[PDB]
Design a protein around this nucleic acid. Structure first.
Ligand SMILES: *O[C@H]1[C@@H](OC)[C@H](n2cnc3c(=O)[nH]c(N)nc32)O[C@@H]1COP(=O)(O)OP(=O)(O)OP(=O)(O)OC[C@H]1O[C@@H]([n+]2cn(C)c3c(=O)[nH]c(N)nc32)[C@H](O)[C@@H]1O
Lengths: 88, 126, 741
RNA sequence: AGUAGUAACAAGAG
RNA sequence: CUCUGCU
């Protein structure tokens, strides 16, 4: 019994993002729970990376591209590349 | 266009597929759609990236031309689809099957007459 | 001196002047009142042609059902629905043999279509019966209602977006012991909930709605047509897809091709028959429709054809293809509005719904309706008549023409095993069959063999209105062939005149119709000029857009006169603004805005082509610069027109008669749905151009897009600190509203 | 009355 | 007294 441990040892919204993403990709999250744990930890670390760090003279310095649906993630990437000119 | 004499002849029109919109031959339908997404909805492109040099050049010129265009993006996208994507149609014809001649088919070829007409402008080398 | 137009045929051959034999200038015959009588007549007639079949009672719906399959062989020339399973299977087997791999390749193509087909495909189509409301609704509306009901019932397997998943939900719904729906009753608005038992929902899922075909030309008596429910259409789409894939691979099947594609295919095939026929062989061509074709095409035979076609395919594919014939074999036909009873002595009217004909006394009816009610009473169940046999206005046109072409291919010399042989063209109930035989006796023998074989398969040739002549001239689906198809302009006359889309779309459509008729239907140039003049006059009168210089008085005359005085270049004015008509044979293909662009006044050009004008409204790309046109004969056509979107591209008022009916709530819901969708486009401009994707709610996508757009705009400097702060705070407020609910 | 034709209109719903 | 003129 590990999935309950993942549920109880993570932020509710982080696990929500993990499960919604997986369900988007069409995987049964009750069997391959190792990928579930890996995705959850990766999202968590990304949030910490973008946590408490702000750009100001308050605004988030780091935009978390992961954890959002594919079209929205690519929309974010395209908008950033079109405004700043960074290569897509 | 140049209008020559009209000749009354026993016209025999055969039904065959012709092109009404030649499209941008170098770019297939999918490439045209990708270019349209780039030009009209750059942010909503997604993961697609333009590779064919023809795509890059036409996307560039169109973006430069479409600068500060208040026209609805949907209309611009539809007009670009018409301009770029090739479209064919089965039509009874008697002369050239190129678009420059099909669009004036009503004017040129008739039941008993042929109107010798030469559409103006450049003609595709193919 | 008695002038007689028909005597013109003494010199001009009938085909060359066939246009004169079309009264299409006059109004088509419409149907007044209810269609319940026509539906009852159709049900009784269909059950009469199969009376010698086997009677059973369905164990699920409880309604009596009639099976004419493998019934007694016909003993007379009257139409008969006793199709033989062995004969149809044999015809399909020989079709497969003569066209190796047709079934396999078609099945794989259908497999890929089934894989890649989404639920949104069902939005296409019109007047789809909505089981939730017991009335005809637009296909999209009926689909949305069915999806909502399924979601409320736990059928939450359709969010994948795939049509096959929706079909799985459809079966799961039928297997449910009970159902819940939402209906509005006004007595004040009440959103009541109705509970349907298993049998009632089953009956209302197989129910087929019926109405009377209006504006139908060439028939003295009106006929009843039917439209299916939402459950049926899903499987019907796949069945038709497979049948159409099969048809495209058949030389004799001209149904999938249309218009000039249809004419070219038919011309080529008839030419091939005339070519491969031996010189010494006597050749004849038969023109004919099939009497009671729809009433006799039993759905059990369609099930047999599908099962044969899906041989060796995956069992799930066989299921997906075979479900539709199963449901149709157990289909039910709604009667309709009902009847209207009058009392002259007391001078009052009343409308009796068709649901209460199974109990009403028979003294209220006239003789004909009296006997129709008496004959149909056994089949009446819950306001619907069981119609297991036949195909009441079936949509299996593709499958039916597959069967017809299979029988048609049965005429090859390797199959006839005789001197005579036959081929031809099949399309729905119409056929043109060419018989080649050494002598007239051979021609007659071949004709008899083909007719008897058709009787065996269930196809009944109409001897009443079919005739045979020497090969070279014939008729097929209102196409008259006289050694080569001849143009019949009278068919396209109703298309002329004001279409009624809007001022710009209607000018573009009128000029395009004239141009297309010149190209196709042999519309001479002088007659083209006539048509242009008459269309412009009709357009001006309809749109009250006479030239400003004219003295004609109309409620729009003052504004047009003021505009006429205002403009410096009169020629640049559009015809909708009192400008002159510059059209001619030269420029029928040029939109008026582009034609008069160089002549337009600068200010007038800006006002007319102002993108911020409130008149222009743009829906999804699929409904841009296109219109639906109904020809005198045939189904609806999607006509695309070239028009520059100007202030004249407005929308006409929408019928508000639903405002004073119990079902206004649907209209309100539509309003709100649009209110949401337009905002989604405000956040995702490409939603209109191409359908958006995602699983998250609309609010989540919009708020995330707003946040990211705010950050990018700030970085580019398009917005200041205060604007970004307000946007972020509003987004947080939206989040709190969603959370609290 | 009359339109019209196999069933309706000759207003309908509050 | 209000609503509708293809619902
Ligand atoms: O549209 C037609 C043709 O123009 C009408 C067009 N086309 C030809 N050349 C060009 C061109 O340079 N640029 C453009 N834009 N378009 C061109 O393509 C179509 C040509 O095909 P079609 O006319 O339908 O038939 P055909 O000309 O016979 O084409 P195809 O059958 O493919 O054969 C092409 C040449 O091959 C020769 N050839 C074939 N084989 C097997 C042999 C061979 O074994 N030995 C020899 N000596 N030659 C062979 C054919 O004879 C033909 O010359």
């Amino acid at each position: 019994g590990m999935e309950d441990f993942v549920r109880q040892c993570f932020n509710p919204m982080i696990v929500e993002l993990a499960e919604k993403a997986m369900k988007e990709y069409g995987e049964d999250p009750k069997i391959e729970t190792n990928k579930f744990a890996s995705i959850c930890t990766h999202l968590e670390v990304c949030f910490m990376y973008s946590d408490f760090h702000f750009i100001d003279e308050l605004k988030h310095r780091f935009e978390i591209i992961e954890g959002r649906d594919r079209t929205m993630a690519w929309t974010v990437v395209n908008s950033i590349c079109n405004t700043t000119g960074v290569e897509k | 266009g140049t209008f020559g004499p009209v000749h009354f002849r026993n016209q025999v029109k055969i039904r065959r597929r012709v092109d009404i919109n030649p499209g941008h031959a170098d770019l297939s339908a999918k490439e045209a759609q990708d270019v349209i997404m780039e030009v009209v909805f750059p942010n909503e492109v997604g993961a697609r990236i333009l590779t064919s040099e023809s795509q890059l050049t036409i996307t560039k010129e169109k973006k430069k031309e479409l600068q500060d265009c208040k026209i609805a993006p949907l209309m611009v996208a539809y007009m670009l689809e018409r301009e770029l994507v090739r479209k064919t149609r089965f039509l009874p014809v008697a002369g050239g099957t190129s678009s420059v001649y099909i669009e004036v088919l009503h004017l040129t070829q008739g039941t008993c007459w042929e109107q010798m007409y030469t559409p103006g402008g450049e003609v595709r080398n193919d | 001196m008695d002038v007689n137009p028909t005597l013109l045929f003494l010199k001009v051959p009938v085909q060359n002047a066939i246009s004169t034999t079309f009264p299409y200038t006059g109004d088509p015959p419409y149907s007044h009142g209810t269609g319940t009588g026509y539906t009852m007549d159709t049900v009784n007639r269909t059950h009469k042609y199969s009376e010698k079949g086997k009677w059973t009672t369905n164990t699920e719906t409880g309604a009596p059902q009639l099976n004419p399959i493998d019934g007694p062989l016909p003993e007379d020339n009257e139409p008969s629905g006793y199709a033989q399973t062995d004969c149809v299977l044999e015809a399909m087997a020989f079709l497969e043999e003569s066209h190796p791999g047709i079934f396999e390749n078609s099945c794989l193509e259908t497999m890929e279509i089934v894989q890649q087909t989404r639920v949104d495909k069902l939005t296409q189509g019109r007047q789809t019966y909505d089981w939730t409301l017991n009335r005809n609704q637009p296909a999209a509306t009926a689909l949305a209602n069915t999806i909502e009901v399924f979601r409320s019932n736990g059928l939450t397997a359709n969010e994948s977006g795939r049509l096959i998943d929706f079909l799985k939900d459809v079966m799961d719904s039928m297997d449910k012991e009970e159902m819940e729906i939402t209906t509005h009753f006004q007595r004040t608005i009440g959103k009541k909930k109705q509970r349907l038992n298993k049998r009632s929902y089953l009956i209302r899922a197989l129910t087929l709605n019926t109405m009377t075909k209006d504006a139908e030309r060439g028939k003295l008596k009106r006929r009843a047509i039917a439209t299916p429910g939402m459950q049926i259409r899903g499987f019907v789409y796949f069945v038709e897809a497979l049948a159409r894939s099969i048809c495209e691979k058949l030389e004799q099947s001209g149904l999938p091709v249309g218009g000039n594609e249809k004419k070219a295919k038919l011309a080529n095939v008839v030419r091939k028959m005339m070519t491969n026929s031996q010189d010494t062989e006597l050749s004849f061509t038969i023109t004919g429709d099939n009497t009671k074709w729809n009433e006799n095409q039993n759905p059990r035979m369609f099930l047999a054809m599908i099962t044969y076609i899906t041989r060796n395919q995956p069992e799930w594919f066989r299921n997906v293809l075979s479900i539709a014939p199963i449901m149709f074999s157990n289909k039910m036909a709604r009667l309709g509005k009902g009847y209207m009873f009058e009392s002259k002595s007391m001078k009052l009217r009343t409308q009796v719904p068709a649901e209460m004909l199974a109990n009403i006394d028979l003294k209220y009816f006239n003789k004909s309706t009296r006997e129709k009610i008496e004959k149909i009473r056994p089949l009446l169940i819950d306001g619907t008549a069981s119609l297991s046999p036949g195909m009441m206005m079936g949509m299996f046109n593709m499958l039916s023409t597959v069967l017809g072409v299979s029988i048609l291919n049965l005429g090859q010399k390797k199959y006839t095993k005789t001197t005579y042989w036959w081929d031809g063209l099949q399309s729905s109930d119409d056929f043109a069959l060419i018989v080649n035989a050494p002598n007239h006796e051979g021609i007659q023998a071949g004709v008899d063999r083909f007719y008897r074989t058709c009787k065996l398969v269930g196809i009944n040739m109409s001897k009443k209105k079919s005739y045979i002549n020497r090969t070279g001239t014939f008729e097929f689906t209102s196409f008259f062939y006289r050694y080569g198809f001849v143009a019949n302009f009278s068919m396209e006359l109703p298309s002329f005149g004001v279409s009624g889309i809007n001022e710009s779309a209607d000018m573009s459509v009128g000029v395009t119709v004239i141009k297309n008729n010149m190209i196709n239907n042999d519309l001479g140039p002088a007659t083209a000029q006539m048509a242009l003049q008459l269309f412009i006059k009709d357009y001006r009168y309809t749109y009250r857009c006479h030239r400003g210089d004219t003295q004609i008085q109309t409620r729009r005359a003052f504004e047009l006169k003021k505009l006429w005085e205002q403009t410096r270049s009169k020629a640049g004015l559009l015809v909708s603004d009192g400008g002159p008509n510059l059209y001619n044979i030269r420029n029928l293909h040029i939109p008026e805005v582009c034609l008069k662009w160089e002549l337009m006044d600068e200010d007038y050009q800006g006002r007319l082509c102002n993108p911020m004008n409130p008149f222009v409204s743009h829906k999804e790309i699929d409904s841009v610069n296109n219109a639906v046109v109904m020809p005198a004969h045939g189904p609806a056509k999607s006509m695309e027109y070239d028009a520059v979107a100007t202030t004249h591209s407005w929308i006409p008022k929408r019928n508000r008669s639903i405002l004073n009916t119990s079902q206004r709530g649907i209209l309100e819901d539509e309003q709100m749905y649009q209110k949401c969708c337009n905002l989604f486009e405000k956040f995702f401009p490409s939603s209109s151009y191409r359908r958006p994707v995602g699983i998250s709610s609309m609010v989540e996508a919009m708020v995330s897009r707003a946040r990211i757009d705010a950050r990018i705009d700030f970085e580019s400097g398009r917005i200041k600190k205060e604007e970004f702060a307000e946007i972020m705070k509003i987004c947080s407020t939206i989040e709190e509203l969603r959370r609290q609910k």
